[PDB]
Amino acid sequence: SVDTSQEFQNNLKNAIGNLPFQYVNGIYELNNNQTNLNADVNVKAYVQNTIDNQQRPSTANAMLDRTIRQYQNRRDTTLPDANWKPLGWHQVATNDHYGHAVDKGALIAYALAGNFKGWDASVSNPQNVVTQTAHSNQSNQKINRGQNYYESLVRKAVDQNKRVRYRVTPLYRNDTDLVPFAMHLEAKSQDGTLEFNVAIPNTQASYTMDYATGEITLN
Ligand SMILES: [Cl-]
Ligand SMILES: [Cl-]
Ligand SMILES: [Mg+2]
């Protein structure tokens, strides 16, 4: 519905330009699932968050391997501000299996880079966390994919001792919006076996969200 809506595809185009895209398995494959990311042997593992000129979390880059892979539970390694809330955060109970509307959506996953020293890997890192639907955050449904599905592919590659160049960009309709309408994920392993370039719609079937405010209107 919203995902395939014309208003959505227009925003996507505004954000990615003349790049081809194709709605498949609940997400948009961009550039025929190919990214320009190059995984060079000579880049050390790292994570870098940015914010845009509107103080919103922007493009995140990383090189992922076993030296920054985080195998421990969050509660053992992080002390997040329990009170902190990302931009446009408006939580509501939902009539679906998630039971709630939005999650704290990490750009770069805790488990992938949480052992990079000096980088805040908690849910309260204000440069790495946005307001994200529970569906687009959590979904591992191969036929209705969320960001987790793609993070899992990356994690599995790392756990096979592959080095993965990784980029996560929140996409905004404009300068004003507090919340991204989609999450752009790109990855490429050194041996090239893993590669993708997708946009995960920041949506959930049970409702619609105003990306300007992050206010949720249930169905
Ligand atoms: Cl091994
Ligand atoms: Cl859903
Ligand atoms: Mg997540």
Author numbering: 43 to 261
Paper quotes:
GBS_NucA was also crystallized in space group P63 in the presence of a divalent Mg2+ ion and a putative substrate DNA, although there was no visible electron density for the DNA. Asn179 is the only residue to directly interact with the metal. An intricate network of putative hydrogen-bonding interactions links the metal in the active center through Asn179 to the distally located Gln180 and His142, using Asp145 as the intermediary. The most significant difference is observed in the ordering of the coil between β-strands 4 and 5 of molecules A and B in the P63 crystal form. This is the first reported structure of a Streptococcus sp. nuclease in which this loop is ordered. Residues Arg116–Asp118 along this loop form a short α-helix (henceforth referred to as α-helix S), although there are no such indications of helical propensity in Arg116–Asp118 in the P1 crystal form. Given that this coil is entirely disordered in the P1 crystal form and is incomplete in molecules C and D of the P63 crystal form, we hypothesize that it is highly mobile in the absence of a DNA substrate. Since Asn179 is the only protein side chain directly chelating the hydrated divalent Mg2+ ion in the active site, these results provide confirmation that the plasmid conversion and SRED assays are performing as expected.
One such nuclease, NucA (Gbs0661) from S. agalactiae (henceforth referred to as GBS_NucA), has been shown to degrade NETs and to improve infection persistence in the host. GBS_NucA is thought to be a sequence-nonspecific DNA/RNA nuclease with endonucleolytic and exonucleolytic activity. Although this family of nucleases share a common ββα metal-finger catalytic core and reaction mechanism, their global structures, localization and regulatory mechanisms can vary widely. As a starting point for such development, we have determined high-resolution X-ray crystal structures of GBS_NucA with and without bound magnesium ion and compared them with those of other ββα metal-finger nucleases.
